[PDB]
Write an enzyme that holds these catalytic residues in place. Structure first.
Site, PDB file in Angstrom:
ATOM      1  N   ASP A 181       0.824  -1.199   0.000  1.00 49.34           N
ATOM      2  CA  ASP A 181       0.000   0.000   0.000  1.00 49.34           C
ATOM      3  C   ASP A 181       0.867   1.262   0.000  1.00 49.34           C
ATOM      4  OD1 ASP A 181      -1.973   1.929   0.290  1.00 49.34           O
ATOM      5  OD2 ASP A 181      -2.454   1.417   2.375  1.00 49.34           O
TER       6      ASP A 181
ATOM      7  N   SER B  49      -0.575  15.591 -12.066  1.00 47.31           N
ATOM      8  CA  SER B  49      -0.845  15.202 -13.438  1.00 47.31           C
ATOM      9  C   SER B  49      -1.072  16.454 -14.263  1.00 47.31           C
ATOM     10  CB  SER B  49      -2.059  14.271 -13.499  1.00 47.31           C
ATOM     11  OG  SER B  49      -2.484  14.070 -14.831  1.00 47.31           O
TER      12      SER B  49
END
Length: 330
Positions: free
Chosen positions: A35, A199
């Protein structure tokens, strides 16, 4: 040193991925959920409330000659999905894919929430975010990656998740046969303890690319792709009959649909998520309403590039002094 381990989806939907981890002496092998959005290595154990164990493999520290109680240390964690776990702490030898750390904090669960009990395939979590998020008190502990770092050939690990297929976590090296083209690296902020990056935009299907900054985290421990409501609305508007359902808890779409791809930007590069990756199947057995793999982050407080996005790429988690993230197509 290096390590290399295969990671396998737990079910037919790729809801999560498990990776075998050797703990203790002799080895006890547990299948853990790696994770990159948390920083605790915790396991089902001989100390876990019996009624809260249903099929998991447990760690038994009393059977490990190298286990030592970390006296006084406790932990307690809550995840974005509402699940939680807590307990005490041992140090022990932990190996992943041939890579061994001695003195690793192994957090033994006394209590786990229902979601964990109900998932017999996950024996615990291995956190790979920054150690500043580790919940051990009063002495915060380091992640497996943090402990291994100095011994690694290169201070990196990579995530190569499969679509309905096994993939690979590598530590300490970049497998140049595992991706196509070049890797595009992008800046990381560690200010919130995550692999947080920006992004450069998105496209829906064959649509034009929208240049826009989307701050988010690279999180192997989250199944879906969570993005701003504007982006997600633009995507699902291209699917006939798709709608946001408050009863179901997100966007659903007719199971008869063909989903468009979704592209996200990494610098000047582009990662394409095929439409099929965005199908998470019937909302309930036999339903003709299907659950979408792109959902709104509104009310989460952060955008999450979860498995839906990451499995479309070869992803480099660069833990050099100045951390960065790399993305390649594959």
């Amino acid at each position: 040193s290096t390590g290399s381990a295969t990671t396998t989806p737990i079910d037919s939907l790729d809801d999560a991925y498990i990776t075998p981890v050797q703990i203790g002496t002799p080895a006890q092998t547990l299948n853990l959920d790696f994770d990159t959005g948390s920083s605790d290595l915790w396991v089902f154990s001989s100390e876990t409330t019996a009624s809260e164990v249903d099929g998991q493999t447990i760690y038994t520290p009393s059977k490990s000659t190298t286990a030592k109680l970390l006296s006084g240390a406790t932990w307690s964690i809550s995840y974005g999905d509402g699940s939680s776990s807590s307990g005490d702490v041992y140090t022990d030898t932990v190996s992943v894919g041939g890579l061994t750390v001695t003195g690793q904090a192994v957090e033994s669960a006394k209590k786990v929430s229902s979601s964990f009990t109900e998932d017999s395939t996950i024996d615990g979590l291995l956190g790979l975010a920054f150690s500043t998020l580790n919940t051990v008190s009063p002495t915060q502990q380091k992640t497996f990656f943090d402990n291994a770092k100095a011994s690694l050939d290169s201070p990196v690990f990579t995530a190569d998740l499969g679509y309905h297929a096994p993939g690979t976590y590598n530590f300490g090296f970049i497998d140049t046969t595992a991706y196509t083209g070049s890797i595009t690296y992008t800046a990381v902020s560690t200010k919130q303890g995550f692999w947080e990056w920006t992004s450069t935009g998105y496209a829906v299907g064959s649509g034009t690319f929208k240049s826009t900054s989307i701050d988010g985290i690279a999180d192997t421990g989250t199944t879906l792709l969570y993005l701003p409501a504007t982006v997600v609305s633009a995507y699902w508007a291209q699917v006939s009959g798709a709608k946001s359902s408050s009863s179901v808890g997100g966007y659903v779409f007719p199971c008869s649909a063909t989903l468009p791809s979704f592209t996200f930007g990494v610098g000047s590069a582009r990662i394409v998520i095929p439409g099929d990756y965005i199908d998470f199947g019937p909302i309930s057995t036999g339903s003709s309403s299907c659950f979408g793999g792109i959902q709104s982050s509104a009310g989460i407080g952060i955008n999450i590039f979860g498995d839906v996005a990451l499995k479309a790429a070869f992803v480099v988690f660069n833990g050099a002094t100045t951390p960065t993230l790399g993305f390649a197509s594959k």
